[PDB]
Design a protein that fits this description.
3 helices; 1 chains; 3-Dehydroquinate Dehydratase; alpha+beta; about 35% helix; Pentafunctional AROM polypeptide; biosynthetic protein; 4 strands; 3-Dehydroquinate Synthase; about 110 residues; Multifunctional Enzyme; about 10% strand
């Protein structure tokens, strides 16, 4: 268990190394909607891309049910461009009435920005 008001770096580092624990991990977050929720979602979806599906509990959304295994490495993994930095060239296209494409940020993007 952890505090809901935990730093995003701590909770996500545990998540990455949870599958390599001696037995299945159950990560609980005490409190409300945690401050690190977008980074939790990011880490889980990435873990999913590496062949390990973390599941939300029925009881509450702030307990995550983590498996025990080894990451299935994909042949190719594309890292998204910084979504904040991405706003500037998109804004240029918006303000000038021209077009601009960002070929790695899509609708399934992990970033809030």
């Amino acid at each position: 268990e952890l505090a809901a008001t935990v730093s995003s770096q701590y909770v996500s580092s545990i998540l990455m190394a949870a599958p390599y624990a001696h037995q299945p991990v159950t990560l609980r977050l005490v409190g409300g909607k945690p401050i690190s929720q977008p980074y939790i979602d990011m880490t889980i979806a990435m873990m999913a891309s590496f062949g390990i599906k973390v599941e939300r509990s029925a009881e509450d959304p702030n307990t995550y049910l983590i498996p025990k295994g080894v990451y299935k490495n994909p042949p190719e993994y594309v890292v998204e461009s910084d979504a904040s930095s991405a706003t500037y060239p998109l804004a240029v296209a918006a303000i000038t009435g021209t077009t601009c494409t960002i070929p790695n940020i899509g609708s399934e993007s992990l970033q809030g920005d």
